[PDB]
Design a protein around this nucleic acid. Structure first.
Ligand SMILES: [Mg+2]
Ligand SMILES: [Mg+2]
Length: 1264
RNA sequence: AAUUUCUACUGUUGUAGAUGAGAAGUCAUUUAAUAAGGCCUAAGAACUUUAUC
DNA sequence: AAATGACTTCTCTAAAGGACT
DNA sequence: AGTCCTTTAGATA
């Protein structure tokens, strides 16, 4: 029996259920005869375009507003000062000092945009369909732009010009409220609320702090690395981006190149508000590419990086600047060169023809082909025809590659010159070939006779380069046949997967050309003007070579152009919205709205149906029709709902049309006008908010109760309210109104009436369907089927848990693959499970791969609310902790880790620290297939990496991860309930993302946890789901606990002895021979014990420089250990590789000698090198092999019985391997939290931060 | 190898588990290309820093 | 530049009211 | 005047 039986019906949540819709009888033929699906297909395209057209207007409006905005230096400085004082301090004085400063700037920007005339009509019917004889704001702006010759839509292929846009806008004339969701998305762009969709948030919450942090990095930088930035280069390189019209500190409106100090003046933040100012600021930081220049113009960050690598000061990396985030809705245009963009397949073959024809037709000034020239030059190079003191290699990575390519090894050349010159320095930018030959021939007498690198292995490498030109000649053979396949204007066929083998041929030609250019690059001498040192060169060689190199170098933009096109994802049809001619289809189920929102639900013989009324026949279910056609057939749902009580009651009782009937007294109007019935509600317009008065609240509730009982319809809800003196705030009354203002009833409608209206196309009827509704389905249904049926179940309607919401949507999805009969009826099919008792299965029917995608389908997305009458758990974590304190002796800890070998690894631990269960999650259960998901995901990740590199389609991995994790979540939920467990995670495409996704899916499942085997009305069943995590808002709001899930710091959890708590904090790495002689006499004793046959190192961690480390330890040379390298991992024994360190230096320890003095009185440099290396082999507790085998954890610190923990030989209540050890210590950190929860005393806060000292103390001292 | 949809199946016109949609915006990352740089916490069958796209 | 993944916002309404036929 | 699309009403850590 669970400690959690009360954590049920705690808070409400929203969900969507999805179903197929199966048209019934003649509804499909009737739908087709009126062309409703094709018209909605077109409307979805038109609606996307209308929204693109409206956004051009928003783009204009945002620029116009931000050009007007000026934030005062005073407000910015006040922001800056408290921003940096909440660094360094967290006094509550400042926290609302900061919120006040922030909010002053937000209100200022808000007033500016509420000032424009364009704002008032941005979100209403005046935008596109103004009355009365007025022009629509959007139509006007479109006409004005057409008069100013502005071409808004040359940038998107869907819209020809302004006149097509105007047609599109006008086609939505009676359809303004269809835009209501989109208008809410656009209101979010301008909100002053603290939401990240707004330009105000983008300016004040994102970009202002980044700018200020950048100002502080600039001032710190000038103090500590003054010559890092070349101020005169940057003024010349980025003068365009340093130009501004207004200096906001001096306020002069002269347009000039600003100084770096001026851009970081706080007033000039007003120049980085809109997108053009953000891009200027970002270019100052990041430089640009300019067409024609080979070198890239540098920005601030590049100077910071280079100076930091030139003087090797790693501390300047903290000064890297942060880019400002883009402005919301803006288009991005770079200030670096923009490559041409190919648009179709024709552009691909035309662009490649043009390049490879030029390369073939080109002649040098000596009238020779590129191939003839290169053969001529390189054959003469090999024949020693050339003066190799006149030929050079660039002394950069191209020479790095040349050694690594020819001698399989870098720096056989690079090292060979650092020697022959020695036989003070600076980088020589180019190196003679004679210097190369003479240097390495002397380098090869130092070198082994076998391992010897000739100079003419280099001259061989180049004699072979003209080889490539008729491999490329043959590659343009076959490509000529591929070229005609694809030269069609506009067709884009080359993005499809059928073209993959042709694309491989296009890429391999491009890659051979590209490889060719990179091999020759080692010869090219640039015209970048530093002429600080130039060379005397064979001038004929460089004449014709450079001409050839320049022609071939056009491969660079060609390669990018083609990649940027071929790697596009093809266009694919997706499902689209169906409207059945109704702009408010299914917006609300209420009986009074059925004529407007033409959707109706029916039940018949345990099946469910959706009916859509034809627009022309929308009275088909009015009261008269229902009485005249009552009969057995279909049970029509009657839905009554009173939503948003806090808005709906005043709306109705104070309306112009009804206020005289409801007759609120002057007292009631006073309370309303000043909102004294609320704590933080809105007064009426013109009135000031006065303070909450509970007596006023209760008079208002009583006015509401009297008005409800007089209301012609709402009284039929049969409200039963608490006594008004029991309410302490008006939300407690609105909740009772909402809880009870929801009723489902049923009318019986004759089957023949439904049939007749379906046959005539007056009703469109669909069965609501998933496979659980099949007459054959005899298994446990899906959770979502259980929720759906619960909506209408009389046990739910007695006391509503599941509630049906308005704003459902209908979709149509076209067939996307051919109907292939993959497994024909009555032919045996092999079973994949090799452990299955049936090696094959046979069916009386066909089996069709992906059958749902082989025909057109209708769908129904239906929103619901779960726990409809439950009260948000604002103190949910506090309630959990109260329970965990009372029941702390039943609680287990389920801690989950990850690592290289495990997507996730768990340990279940009891209150004493015993492991009860421990295993990897790589293989599930109880999974009959025994799939190793660690191998499966790694195989998908590698296939995706190859697809990117081969320009092939990139498959999805997230569905693969979610499907695996859905089984892990299921296992964790059973373990939580079975063992009264809490779940503990370590705080923090690469599957360490799986760990984060596991957390996310587990939190969501524990928001609302139903066990399908439990009974409907009992704990864990459909009406009483467990809620064990807190309602999820965001991750920043989440903190370190959500319900029974806790996050603990990650440090020191894997490499730590599970018995002694020992951790290597020595960090022994070697450098100086006295620091080592200092390091080792820093011990208490080093000794030998032959009772046991191993050495000892007694020491206290405080006598070493790190004072964080506590405790005296004696570590021992006991046991095996392993080590990797690269040709692989070997096995070593430290307690005897020690004797060879004692044989060469004639130490002797044999009879128990305290050996400490001897090692400190040696100074062979590398006697220490072995000694330090064998000491950290002692501290290496985690020990892995390159094999498929697991890795174990061994401890060099003995327990009280003097035994040494080994994971290979460990009791079941202790870690069985090293990965288990990591999860175990996450769990021990959870035991600490459980002890704080248990020992907390009522009133005071729970401290859940665990510092390492507390952890080390806990782990070191719980055994002793 | 069937699905509201996803994963694994054959569990037999389906079995098991999971499944909050639609709309909007933004950020992050990967891969390629390119520039100037480091280097045997990782690596020349290169590894890697900053930056542009 | 192409691509996928992940995060944060809004809605999940009946009825009053206005414009037009 | 009746119709029907668009706007409206504005709690609660
Ligand atoms: Mg089932
Ligand atoms: Mg499948």
């Amino acid at each position: 029996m669970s400690i959690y039986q009360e954590f049920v019906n705690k808070y409400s949540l929203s969900k969507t259920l999805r179903f197929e819709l199966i048209p019934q009888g003649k509804t499909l033929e009737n739908i087709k005869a009126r062309g409703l699906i094709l018209d909605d297909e077109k409307r979805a395209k038109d609606y996307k375009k209308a929204k693109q057209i409206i956004d051009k207007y928003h783009q204009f409006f945002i620029e116009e507003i931000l050009s007007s905005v000026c934030i005062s230096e005073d407000l910015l400085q006040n922001y800056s000062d408290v921003y940096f004082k909440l660094k360094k301090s967290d006094d509550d004085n400042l926290q609302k000092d900061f919120k006040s400063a922030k909010d002053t700037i937000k209100k200022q920007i808000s007033e500016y945009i509420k000032d424009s005339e364009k704002f008032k009509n941005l979100f209403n019917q005046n935008l596109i369909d103004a009355k009365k004889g007025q022009e629509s704001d959007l139509i006007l702006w479109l006409k004005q732009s057409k008069d100013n010759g502005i071409e808004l839509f040359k940038a998107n292929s869907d819209i020809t010009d302004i006149d097509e846009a105007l047609e599109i806008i006008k086609s939505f004339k009676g359809w303004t409220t269809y835009f209501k969701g989109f208008h809410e998305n656009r209101k979010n762009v301008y909100s002053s609320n603290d939401i990240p969709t707004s330009i105000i948030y983008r300016i004040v919450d994102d970009n202002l702090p980044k700018f200020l942090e950048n100002k502080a990095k600039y001032e710190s930088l000038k103090d500590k690395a003054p010559e890092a930035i070349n101020y005169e280069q940057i003024k010349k390189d980025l003068a365009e981006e340093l130009t501004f019209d207004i200096d906001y500190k001096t306020s002069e409106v002269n347009q000039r190149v600003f100084s770096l100090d001026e851009v970081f003046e706080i007033a000039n933040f007003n120049n980085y508000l809109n997108q053009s100012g953000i891009t200027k600021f970002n270019t100052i930081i990041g430089g640009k590419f300019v067409n024609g220049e080979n070198t890239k113009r540098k920005g601030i960050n590049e100077y910071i990086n280079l100076y930091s690598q030139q003087i090797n000061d790693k501390t300047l990396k903290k000064y890297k600047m942060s880019v400002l985030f883009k402005q919301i809705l803006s288009d991005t245009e770079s200030k670096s060169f923009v490559i041409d963009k190919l648009e179709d397949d024709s552009d691909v073959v035309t662009t490649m023809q043009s390049f490879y024809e030029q390369i073939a037709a080109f002649k040098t000034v000596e009238e020779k082909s590129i191939k003839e020239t290169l053969s001529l030059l390189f054959d003469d190079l090999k024949a020693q025809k050339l003066d190799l003191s006149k030929i050079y290699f660039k002394n950069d990575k191209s020479l790095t590659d040349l050694s690594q390519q020819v001698f399989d090894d870098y720096s056989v050349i690079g090292t060979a010159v650092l020697e022959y010159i020695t036989q003070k320095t600076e980088k020589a930018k180019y190196l003679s070939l004679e210097t190369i030959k003479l240097a390495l021939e002397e380098f090869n007498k130092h070198r082994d006779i076998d391992k010897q690198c000739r100079f003419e292995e280099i001259l061989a490498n180049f004699a072979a380069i003209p080889m490539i030109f008729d491999e490329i000649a043959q590659n343009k053979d076959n490509l000529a046949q591929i070229s005609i396949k694809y030269q069609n204007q506009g067709k884009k066929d080359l993005l499809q997967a059928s073209a993959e083998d042709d694309v491989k041929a296009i890429k391999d030609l491009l890659d051979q050309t590209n490889n060719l250019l990179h091999k020759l690059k080692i010869f090219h001498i640039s015209q970048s003007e530093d002429k600080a040192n130039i060379l005397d060169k064979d001038e004929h060689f460089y004449l014709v070579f450079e001409e050839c190199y320049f022609e071939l170098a056009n491969i660079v933009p060609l390669y990018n152009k083609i990649r940027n096109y071929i790697t596009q994802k093809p266009y694919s049809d997706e499902k689209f919205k169906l409207n059945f001619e109704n702009s408010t289809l299914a917006n609300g189920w209420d009986k009074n709205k059925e004529p407007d929102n033409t959707a109706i639900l029916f039940i018949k013989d345990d099946k469910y149906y959706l009916g859509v009324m034809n627009k022309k026949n929308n009275k088909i279910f009015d009261d008269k029709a229902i009485k005249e056609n009552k009969g057995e057939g279909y049970k029509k749902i009657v839905y009554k709902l009173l939503p948003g009580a806090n808005k709906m009651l005043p709306k109705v009782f104070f309306s112009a049309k009804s206020i005289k009937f409801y007759n609120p007294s002057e007292d009631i109007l006073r309370i309303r006008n000043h909102s004294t019935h609320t704590k933080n509600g809105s007064p009426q317009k013109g009135y000031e908010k006065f303070e909450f008065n509970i007596e006023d609240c209760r008079k208002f509730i009583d006015f509401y109760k009297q008005s409800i009982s007089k209301h012609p319809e709402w009284k039929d809800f049969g409200f039963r309210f608490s006594d008004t003196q029991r309410y302490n705030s008006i939300d407690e009354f609105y909740r009772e109104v909402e809880n009870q203002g929801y009723k489902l009833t049923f009318e019986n409608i004759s089957e023949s009436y439904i049939d007749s209206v379906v046959n005539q196309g007056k009703l469109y009827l669909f069965q609501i369907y998933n496979k659980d509704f099949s007459a054959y389905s005899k298994g446990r249904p899906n959770l979502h089927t259980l929720y759906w049926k619960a909506l209408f179940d009389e046990r739910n309607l007695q006391d509503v848990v599941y509630k049906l919401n308005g704003e459902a949507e209908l979709f149509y999805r076209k067939q996307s693959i051919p109907k292939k009969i993959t497994h024909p009826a009555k032919e045996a099919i092999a079973n994949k499970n090799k452990d299955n008792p049936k090696k094959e299965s046979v069916f009386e029917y066909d089996l069709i791969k992906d059958k749902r995608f082989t025909e057109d389908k209708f769908f129904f997305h239906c929103p619901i609310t779960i726990n409809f009458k439950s009260s948000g758990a604002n103190k949910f974590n506090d309630e959990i902790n109260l329970l965990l304190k009372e029941k702390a002796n039943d609680v287990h800890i389920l801690s989950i880790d990850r690592g290289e070998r495990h997507l996730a690894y768990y340990t279940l631990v009891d209150g004493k620290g015993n492991i009860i269960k421990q295993d990897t999650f790589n293989i599930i259960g109880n999974d009959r297939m025994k799939t190793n998901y660690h191998d499966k995901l790694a195989a998908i990740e590698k296939d995706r990496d190859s697809a990117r590199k081969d320009w092939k389609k990139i498959n999805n991995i997230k569905e693969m991860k979610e499907g695996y994790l859905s089984q892990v979540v299921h296992e964790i939920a059973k373990l939580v309930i079975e063992y009264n467990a809490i779940v503990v995670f370590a705080d923090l495409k690469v599957e360490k993302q799986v760990y984060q996704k596991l957390e996310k899916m587990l939190i969501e499942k524990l928001n609302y946890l139903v066990f399908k085997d439990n009974e409907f009305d009992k704990t864990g069943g459909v009406l009483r789901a467990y809620q064990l995590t807190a309602p999820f808002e965001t991750f920043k709001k989440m903190g370190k606990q959500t319900g029974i899930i806790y996050y603990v710091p990650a440090g020191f959890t894997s490499k730590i002895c599970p018995v002694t708590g020992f951790v290597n904090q020595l960090y022994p790495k070697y450098e100086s021979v006295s620091k080592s002689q200092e390091f080792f006499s820093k011990f208490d004793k080093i000794c030998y014990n032959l009772d046991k046959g191993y050495f000892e190192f007694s020491f206290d961690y405080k006598n070493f420089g790190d004072k964080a480390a506590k405790g005296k330890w004696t570590i021992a040379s006991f046991g095996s250990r392993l080590i990797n390298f690269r040709n692989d991992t070997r096995e070593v024994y430290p307690t005897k590789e020690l004797e060879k360190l004692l044989k060469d230096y004639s130490i002797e320890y044999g009879h128990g000698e305290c050996i400490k003095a001897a090692i400190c009185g040696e100074s062979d440099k590398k006697f220490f090198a072995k000694l330090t290396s064998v000491l950290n082999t002692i501290l290496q507790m985690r020990n892995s092999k390159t094999g498929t085998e697991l890795d174990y954890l061994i401890s060099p610190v003995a327990d009280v019985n003097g035994n040494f923990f080994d994971s290979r030989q460990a009791p079941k209540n202790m870690p069985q391997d090293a990965d288990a050890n990591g999860a175990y210590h996450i769990g021990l950190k959870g035991l600490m939290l459980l002890g704080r929860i248990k020992n907390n005393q009522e009133g005071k806060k729970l401290n859940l931060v665990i510092k390492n000292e507390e952890y080390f103390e806990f782990v070191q001292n719980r055994n002793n």
